[PDB]
Structures are given as structure tokens and as C-alpha cells.
Amino acid sequence: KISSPTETERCIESLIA
């Protein structure tokens, strides 16, 4: 789970949009 930080950046950016 949570292999790379790029995945979290994509989940935060989508919640903002």
C-alpha cells in the first residue's frame, strides 16, 4: 500500500478539482 508519493499527489489533486 502507498508504494509511491506520486499516487497520493493524484488523490489530493482530484479531490480539489
Swiss-Prot record:
Entry function: Facilitates the differentiation and the cornification of keratinocytes.
Residue numbers of Phosphothreonine PTMs: T8
Residues found modified as Phosphoserine: S3, S4
Quaternary data: Homodimer; disulfide-linked.
Origin species: Homo sapiens
Modification N6-acetyllysine, positions: K1
Record protein name field: Protein S100-A11
Source organism phylogeny: Eukaryota, Metazoa, Chordata, Craniata, Vertebrata
Locations listed in the record: Cytoplasm; Nucleus
Post-translational modification, as annotated: Phosphorylation at Thr-8 by PRKCA significantly suppresses homodimerization and promotes association with NCL/nucleolin which induces nuclear translocation.
Domain of life: Eukaryota
